[PDB]
Amino acid sequence: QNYPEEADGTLDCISMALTCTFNRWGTLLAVGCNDGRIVIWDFLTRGIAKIISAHIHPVCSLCWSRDGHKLVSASTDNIVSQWDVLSGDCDQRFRFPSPILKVQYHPRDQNKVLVCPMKSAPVMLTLSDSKHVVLPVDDDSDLNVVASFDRRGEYIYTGNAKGKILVLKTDSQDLVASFRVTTGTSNTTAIKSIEFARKGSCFLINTADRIIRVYDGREILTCGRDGEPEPMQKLQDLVNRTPWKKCCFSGDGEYIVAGSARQHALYIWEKSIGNLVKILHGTRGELLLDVAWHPVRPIIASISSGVVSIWAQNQVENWSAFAPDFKELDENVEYEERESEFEDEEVDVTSV
Amino acid sequence: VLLALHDRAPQLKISDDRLTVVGEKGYSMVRASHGVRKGAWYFEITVDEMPPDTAARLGWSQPLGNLQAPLGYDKFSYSWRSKKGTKFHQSIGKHYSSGYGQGDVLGFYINLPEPHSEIIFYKNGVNQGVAYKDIFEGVYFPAISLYKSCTVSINFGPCFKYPPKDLTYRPMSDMG
Amino acid sequence: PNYALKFTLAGHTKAVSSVKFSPNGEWLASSSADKLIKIWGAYDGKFEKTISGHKLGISDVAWSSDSNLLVSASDDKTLKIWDVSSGKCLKTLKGHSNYVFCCNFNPQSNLIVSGSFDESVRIWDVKTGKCLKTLPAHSDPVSAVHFNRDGSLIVSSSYDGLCRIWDTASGQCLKTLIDDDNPPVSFVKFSPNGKYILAATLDNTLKLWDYSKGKCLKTYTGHKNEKYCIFANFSVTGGKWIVSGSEDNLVYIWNLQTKEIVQKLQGHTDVVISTACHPTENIIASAALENDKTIKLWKS
Amino acid sequence: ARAEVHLRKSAFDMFNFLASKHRQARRATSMDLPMPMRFRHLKKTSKEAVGVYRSPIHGRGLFCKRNIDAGEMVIEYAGNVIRSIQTDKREKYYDSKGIGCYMFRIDDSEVVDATMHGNAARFINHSCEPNCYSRVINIDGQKHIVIFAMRKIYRGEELTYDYKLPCNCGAKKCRKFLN
Amino acid sequence: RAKAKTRSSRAGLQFPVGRVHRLLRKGNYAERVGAGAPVYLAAVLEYLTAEILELAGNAARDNKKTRIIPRHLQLAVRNDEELNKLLGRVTIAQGGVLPNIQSVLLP
């Protein structure tokens, strides 16, 4: 199949759901609620797995780990704690300067996480102790700087409060690439959030003037430090003027989905050709909060005031599984069937 | 000798030269309405267009048989398969002979003094096999059941292309 | 190769229902059809307690992931839920209009498959005890049910001889296994890769199925497989033996590379119908029908 | 409980469809329009108009899920258009397998199979008190087997026709011989 | 100074765009006609025309014909529900009616 089309139910059990994220495999979905409750479901049989009522405070950010065991907390008292899918116990606890927006682990080591405040440069820590590595940003004027790892774990792409991108190394801070985009006519505007794919090096630019640009993680390294690249694909809207809230990718880098912030909508473009191909809808007067794409099957989870809707392709039942010798035809199918009228290879049964 | 008007398979591609049968998809068998009663009637079958992947089962059949009977269904109809020469008679499949070439002049014959039989595979006077023996007496119209729509002609003249040598026959200028 | 009897665990007042080890591999408790479920050991026959509080007979009994919480396929249209460490009759599953013969769990251990004699395979819960869905599969009573390795596919073994494989997400048929004869399928299970199923039908001819294509590969000859729901097992502790029940006071255990008659255990005095292996040890469980009432643990 | 080696363990049926339930001029197909205009909308109606459930006459019957008015089409009976001597070989073959004959003929030269290939139109029993009949039309020469109605039929009734052995209809003037 | 590709195939359409923009200027509907409004409107007109010509051509084949006469348009409009709810008060010339005899008249 392909991109989803139909509604297909919900899970309106837990009150006041707020955020959501997946693992690598696509079978784990934790939800940081409005009161610290962290709830996991099932996907194959769809049962509530484990409520983790961790804090008395609400949660604003989470992330899964590479082994499928470890999580990370972000409350309104800056508490970052290491969790487990076997026990579910608190490990670490300390206080940042007051704002914490989003965290992100290192991909090829579960030692390091990248933590981002509001009015400060993003800070990378470890999980052994409270060691933190100071990351320098070029402006250092407003300090509203976003940062994220790439796919494979080579560099760290950062985004300032003014419209200039730095490409640093994860430990030695090697500024090796930078670029400024010609934002419209006069004003260069800030970046909300940059996310990254799973097949290749494609990524997206989400500005604050409602234009999505498509780039690659090799062309900027080819252009070196202080180069001028062009967008591989420009994505925008004109009719409703469409503010954005959340951005992510499709399964193997095929399509691009992006939830909106006004009309409770989901749009599906194509990275290959470059045109919109399907518009989704839902409840008319809700408020879209978090959108997650499912990595090995076309499922999209959307939180709008607790409700998590799962657009899941609307499978169609038929015959030919009951009696696999009878073919349910459509019209008259006439023919004649026959022109002529009437080894010890040890395969492991335990091949796990 | 002209063919039939009503005693024929209707949905076949009837050619306007009135000496050539062109088939369809499937085994719908035309029986041309001029066949033997007693004694001898020999004619040849000139082949114009025989494409591959064809099962040209040729032989003898009666007006008791179905029009939709493939030639090789019962004790009355005979069979000569292209692939591996196999006979299919009374629903018995035994790999009998070899195949056959493309572009020859075919033709079968029965010899019955009024019975002693010559039911033997005939092709340019070269024997491919003694087919069967000792039929009952009746009407035997020639039967054509094809798999493709192959353009194949028919002959009736006394000066044959490759007749059976020293043949006892009757000319087709008497009852056809 | 040198399995020797250690202990004979007799004491069942009626026909011994089934021997099932603990899923974590430390118990071998044995129940009977006398509405009484005892808690026996696996290495010396260490006894704990006897479950009481049923109304009619017992066909199947089950376990938990920590080998404490219990449930049994009771023959009063119920499935009473039990425990080892507390013993309280936890719940009782209604929703049946006929007898219940078998039930199992997903490996996540919160669902109950119910292939009962009312012939519509329902999907029950453990946390809520609620009938999720229904698989109206057969017009014949269910002989056995089984999940696959992860918990994503259910096989349907029935009297008519149709080994269909059923979806779990929305519950639909995917394939129908067919045969020229009509034997009653007794007890089948999957493989450790989910791509092989040994067939145990009542025709005195076992079958092993290529799942992904749909053909039979390797069989056996010279065995008595006719009357009841005859069980089959696996063995990887010794060789690649195939532990199976037997009606002639034996235990059918042979290898599948060899396909021969190489080892025949003996000692039972009735039809052996339930066998099971310890997952790591060289312990093969064995318990025959009503005229034997014993447990023979032949240990290598 | 494990003491019943009991019978009725054979089905002889490839169709195990029977489940526990067994629940028993605004449009185009009831107009006076020409025939292919109704023949298009035939398939958009027949996929969801009727249903197949268990009947007391012989196994599975045809209880429709829509209030059909009189005069209009319902469904087409289509399958392998077989030619007339393969019928006898399939009679011998399904005599060897033990499954009944499902063969309606368009004309007396070509018959239509239903057992090997077809649709849900096989579940129409014979009765001597029908409420439907049959007419063959000409959709560009490719003729069909389409079933009309006779009277006003409501929701939850079996649909039958004359096929032209004792019958299980129980008619007021029954013939009891289907030849 | 180079080649000029039109605004009819820059968006992949069939109805013209410059003619629609001229008819929105020369009509006094408002002062200032916007940027892509004629493109949006020409797409809408394309969709409606394709929707009605599909049913028209289908009925024209089903009456064993090759050209189209307005009886086919009458049938194609008055059969469907949505177009009958739109085109309420319209008399197509040479149109004709739909066959509807009541229940109690015929014996």
Ligand SMILES: Nc1ncnc2c1ncn2[C@@H]1O[C@H](CSCC[C@H](N)C(=O)O)[C@@H](O)[C@H]1O
């Ligand atoms: N009045 C009747 N009672 C029982 N069988 C009948 C019958 N009239 C015809 N038949 C036979 O029954 C077949 C109907 S098919 C019956 C429905 C479907 N096969 C099922 O699952 O029940 C026909 O092929 C016909 O040969």
Ligand SMILES: [Zn+2]
């Ligand atoms: Zn009757």
